């Protein structure tokens, strides 16, 4: 069975092992899945990232496929580029593009971003998400987590282990999945769900940006689900410390009835956009520069 | 509490 499992990965991944060319495997992160290592082409002297994801480790040991379904079909500008997948032993391996600015979780949780910067953010993964939503993927797990940076302030969607596809035979999807405090409440409440709880997910992630923290964050888990269920939409901590033109965007977001929330072409037009910034003005929140 | 575990 984990066996079984092995064999049909086998047959979706590229043949061989990365070891063969990567040197200096140094751990840099986890996630749900397993963890992430930089690793040096031997070649070149060039730096990739190696995703590490134990198949006895899985919740849902299928949703590892995702990884292969996005790399082969896709990619865009603000989004991770995957460039090989292999099986290695017991763990599936996906050798991608190393975001070296590393994740926007480290920017929220030590400095204060202002609405340039936030608003460059949110354009990048509107992008990302218009795009990925008109082919019928949902990320599903949209948070500062899967947000990540390059040097120059490149803003790019990671992290894509629990997507899921919608279209026309399937038209809406039914998992409980994602992160607690950044589900969105139809999802919470089990009902069918589409491309919309990522912009509920989004509105969360501002809050991240303004608060430092999504909110009941230090409630437990499930309480914090049962919250976001039954209240009014979650509010800003800070709500003084935002422009209107900003709070008008949050507002098109965490709504609670999917049928009235903003989708992601709508948003690329909102005025709070015409705010972001270059990349260049994201570059000073990174720890290398703060 | 202050949980960034998915699900």
């Given at each position: 069975?984990?066996?079984?499992?092995?064999?049909?990965?086998?047959?979706?991944?590229?043949?061989?092992?990365?070891?063969?060319?990567?040197?200096?495997?140094?751990?840099?992160?986890?996630?749900?899945?397993?963890?992430?290592?930089?690793?040096?082409?031997?070649?070149?002297?060039?730096?990739?990232?190696?995703?590490?994801?134990?198949?006895?480790?899985?919740?849902?040991?299928?949703?590892?496929?995702?990884?292969?379904?996005?790399?082969?079909?896709?990619?865009?500008?603000?989004?991770?580029?995957?460039?090989?997948?292999?099986?290695?032993?017991?763990?599936?391996?996906?050798?991608?593009?190393?975001?070296?600015?590393?994740?926007?979780?480290?920017?929220?949780?030590?400095?204060?971003?202002?609405?340039?910067?936030?608003?460059?953010?949110?354009?990048?993964?509107?992008?990302?998400?218009?795009?990925?939503?008109?082919?019928?993927?949902?990320?599903?797990?949209?948070?500062?987590?899967?947000?990540?940076?390059?040097?120059?302030?490149?803003?790019?969607?990671?992290?894509?282990?629990?997507?899921?596809?919608?279209?026309?035979?399937?038209?809406?999807?039914?998992?409980?999945?994602?992160?607690?405090?950044?589900?969105?409440?139809?999802?919470?409440?089990?009902?069918?769900?589409?491309?919309?709880?990522?912009?509920?997910?989004?509105?969360?992630?501002?809050?991240?940006?303004?608060?430092?923290?999504?909110?009941?964050?230090?409630?437990?888990?499930?309480?914090?689900?049962?919250?976001?269920?039954?209240?009014?939409?979650?509010?800003?901590?800070?709500?003084?410390?935002?422009?209107?033109?900003?709070?008008?965007?949050?507002?098109?977001?965490?709504?609670?009835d999917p049928a009235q929330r903003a989708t992601a072409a709508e948003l690329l037009k909102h005025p709070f956009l015409a705010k972001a910034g270059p990349p260049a003005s994201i570059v000073p929140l990174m720890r290398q520069n703060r | 509490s202050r949980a960034r575990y998915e699900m």
């Amino acid at each position: 069975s984990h066996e079984q499992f092995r064999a049909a990965l086998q047959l979706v991944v590229d043949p061989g092992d990365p070891r063969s060319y990567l040197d200096n495997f140094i751990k840099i992160g986890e996630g749900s899945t397993g963890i992430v290592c930089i690793a040096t082409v031997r070649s070149s002297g060039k730096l990739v990232a190696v995703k590490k994801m134990d198949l006895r480790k899985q919740q849902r040991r299928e949703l590892l496929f995702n990884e292969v379904v996005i790399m082969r079909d896709y990619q865009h500008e603000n989004v991770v580029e995957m460039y090989n997948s292999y099986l290695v032993g017991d763990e599936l391996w996906v050798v991608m593009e190393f975001l070296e600015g590393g994740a926007l979780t480290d920017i929220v949780t030590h400095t204060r971003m202002n609405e340039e910067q936030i608003a460059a953010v949110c354009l990048a993964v509107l992008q990302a998400l218009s795009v990925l939503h008109a082919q019928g993927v949902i990320h599903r797990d949209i948070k500062s987590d899967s947000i990540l940076l390059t040097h120059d302030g490149r803003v790019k969607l990671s992290d894509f282990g629990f997507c899921a596809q919608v279209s026309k035979e399937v038209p809406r999807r039914k998992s409980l999945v994602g992160t607690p405090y950044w589900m969105a409440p139809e999802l919470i409440s089990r009902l069918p769900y589409g491309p919309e709880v990522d912009i509920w997910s989004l509105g969360i992630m501002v809050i991240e940006m303004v608060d430092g923290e999504p909110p009941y964050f230090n409630e437990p888990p499930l309480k914090a689900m049962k919250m976001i269920r039954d209240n009014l939409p979650p509010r800003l901590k800070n709500l003084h410390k935002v422009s209107p033109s900003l709070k008008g965007f949050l507002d098109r977001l965490l709504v609670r009835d999917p049928a009235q929330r903003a989708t992601a072409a709508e948003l690329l037009k909102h005025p709070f956009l015409a705010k972001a910034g270059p990349p260049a003005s994201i570059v000073p929140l990174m720890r290398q520069n703060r | 509490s202050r949980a960034r575990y998915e699900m």
